[PDB]
């Protein structure tokens, strides 16, 4: 369908980044696991993060974590680093062109 | 692993802008392929597609991107030949590559295809 | 009125082993080798004399359920002769319909039964039954491996057959290969007087051998 | 309907369709070239059209591409064990190919569903309809889910966007008795043309002889096939086509 994401956050190093992927119409999965997570760094190609929000693994650092409930998908990135934060994305599935998120980027102060 | 793309191009609206997605580091058949756009000041838009063991090449229907997609599996090269060009087609296009079956994914990405259609 | 509409064969007829069928209605046949079960009394039912003569084309009923099925097909005045036999698991059939006016007796008369069907159905049958219209007779034979002498005609239509074991005279024809047998003595067979039972006679009291 | 039936049953189930009382053309089944693998185990692929079977059985289902390799007598796995089996004497061919863009759905269509745990192994060409919750942990599962208590089955997502393995590959398997029962299914029997007044070997319906084929007046009885003569010399023949 169409989804919405948490547009931005402004935080400090060594913290959690709570990122809501909010899906309009379809909510997650019939098989109980869907949507996704993706990251595109500024001046950089996009990059995979998580799929079905609960999943993926090696190649995606441990800081990337979270889950989702129906529409909302929570990308929870613990212990933020000022070098590691960049625009994030989540793909839909099961309906419509899978599209992506509106983009998600967590600023870090200091 | 690595998606190499065709270089930039600048055309007028209404034509057909060809592209190529060069595959380095994976079997191009085993992976359904795509061309996804990141437009200026926009979200990632999944646009163009092709499946692995078949021909899928569906788009967002909407106004069809319509961009001609084909494969040379010897070249491992996915093509994007963009039909109904327009000024909005200015963007950075990413031919993407999916994971094996599941809730996703797009594993790796192209480096982007700079595309500008304007006067 | 065409009372005799059916057959049910088998070696169990219990719905278990392979149980043939035949039926008839509106000239349009039935067959199954489906293995199925029945009422105490397989039959065909009817009620009488209306806009549906014999009504009750809803008889329907011999049987339980057609189950694990290895074939299918579909499509006095009278005499209808049907030979049935199994060889190489091919159930076979022959037939006629020949008109007669009479009641009690198989007309002394001769006609040969061409085939209708070969069935390679592989049923292995010891018994059978038949069916009838409920609200007119029939016969049965049994076949035994004789030797005949068949006389074809210019069309290949068997005009006449001649037995052998029937009696002496018809073992003369079987020797000459001719229906017309003229005067004089024609040596045919041997006759070897039967044995009676057997006499086993063995040295008595027999002890016991020690293979052991 | 073996191959061309639109929606096949899912993998935990399948359909046993007897094929008998017909002539079976394997050529197009051999020559269609729409099938990923035309895989014979105990028989000759090009000699099918020449080979005749009493029984034939088709079982039509959907498996992961990587499971396509798994089906072969002697090849076990999640498949052979639980959802559906292979004979270990299995003899016959196997035909697999993808339905992907048809049977897959972008949502990972969950119709095609494979047996997760049912302890036993099926008998050749058999199934089980068991939905009973599997018991892993010795603690009684009470027929419901719980700790180490698994639903006996598991449901493939098939996305068109899947990799090779995870696309649906429709697999129909064949079967037979060969001969030794009354024969029903045979391959097509290829008639030639005809030549008259030229000495030829010939074969008719299996009658084999050699002579000068000529038109004749004499009439048969519609069920009669050959002719003969006094000497039992096969003479007339009724042209089968
Ligand atoms: C064909 O069917 C007959 C059905 O009777 C089978 O005959 C039985 O054979 C056993 C031993 O061979 C006897 O003890 C029984 O008495 C027979 N049946 C009856 C009713 O007497 C026969 O075995 C079958 N043949 C095959 C090959 O299946
Ligand atoms: C005779 O039996 C058949 C068996 O299929 C039944 O379906 C049908 O109604 C009957 N009548 C005709 C004319 O076949
Ligand atoms: C043989 O058939 C012909 C017609 O084909 C017929 O005129 C003749 O009477 C028949 N004779 C016999 C004995 O069948
Ligand atoms: C299945 O049907 C298609 C068209 O409906 C046909 O081209 C194909 O040959 C069929 N399959 C086989 C094995 O013949």
Residue numbers in the entry:
A (entry chain D): 2 to 111
B (entry chain E): 2 to 120
C (entry chain C): 98 to 172, 186 to 245, 263 to 339
D (entry chain A): 340 to 580
Published text:
Like SARS-CoV, SARS-CoV-2 utilizes its protuberant S glycoprotein to engage with its cellular receptor, human angiotensin converting enzyme 2 (ACE2), for forging membrane fusion in order to enter the host cell. Each monomeric S protein can be cleaved by host proteases, such as TMPRSS2, into two functional domains, the distal globular S1 domain and the membrane-proximal S2 domain, which mediate receptor binding and membrane fusion, respectively. The S1 subunit consists of an N-terminal domain (NTD) and a C-terminal domain, which often functions as the receptor binding domain (RBD). Here we have identified and characterized a potent human monoclonal antibody, HB27, that blocks SARS-CoV-2 attachment to its cellular receptor at sub-nM concentrations.
